[PDB]
Amino acid sequence: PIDITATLRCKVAVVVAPVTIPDTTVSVELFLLDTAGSDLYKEQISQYWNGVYYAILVFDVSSMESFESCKAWFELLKSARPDRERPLRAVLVANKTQVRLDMAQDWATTNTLDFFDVSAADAPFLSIATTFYRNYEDKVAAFQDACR
């Protein structure tokens, strides 16, 4: 900032972080809706609420409860989407204060979630941010093509 030529914004259920995309001149702001904020709830009841299509699921390595809790959430989040056509981009994150990280990586892989261990950094954000940027860059060219 101020080399930025465009700022993108992205709604992210976590169960404002600006991330610059390398090697771009673009900035992506993640609007992080921590469930139990309750940012998320304020938004769901909101008039014009559009649903959420990006998540960061976090769990504590030493609580299998919190991990399984993240799977429930993910399936819900998938089911709660208004627009079946847009997929649910999610990222699983391990962190400290039991859980088989080998098993956790797996599930995620099976389920097409990006995995990140934070015990004991911004990569899960960098990850959701690039994904989002990719859609922008695609839609944005479809638009240009649509209207010739």
Label residue 36 left, alpha or beta by phi (over 0 means left) and psi (-120 to 50 means alpha).
left
Considering only the stretches 33-41, 66-74, 94-102, 140-148, report the one whose residues sit in contact with other proteins under the rule CB under 8 A. Answer: 140-148
CA distance 36 to 55: 14
- Total residue count of the chain as it appears in this document: 148
Considering only the stretches 61-69, 113-121, 122-130, 133-141, report the one whose residues sit in contact with other proteins under the rule CB under 8 A. Answer: 133-141
| Tokens standing for residue 43 | 């938004």
Q: Which three-class secondary structure state does DSSP give residue 146?
A: helix
- One residue of 86, 96, 100, 134 binding other proteins per CB under 8 A: 86
**Interface with other proteins, residue 129, by CB under 8 A:** no
Chain centroid to CA 87: how far? 11
Chain centroid to CA 35: how far? 13
Least separation, in Å, of the C-beta of 104 and other proteins? 29
| Tokens standing for residue 78 | 């998938």
- One residue of 36, 45, 48, 97 binding other proteins per CB under 8 A: 48
Sign of the torsion formed by the C-alpha atoms of 109, 121, 28 and 80: positive
- Residue 34 is assigned to a ligand binding site: yes
Least separation, in Å, of the C-beta of 35 and other proteins? 18
Least separation, in Å, of the C-beta of 96 and other proteins? 32
Name the site residues for other proteins (rule: CB under 8 A). 5-11, 26, 31, 48, 50, 53, 83, 86, 132, 135-136, 139-140, 143-144, 146-148
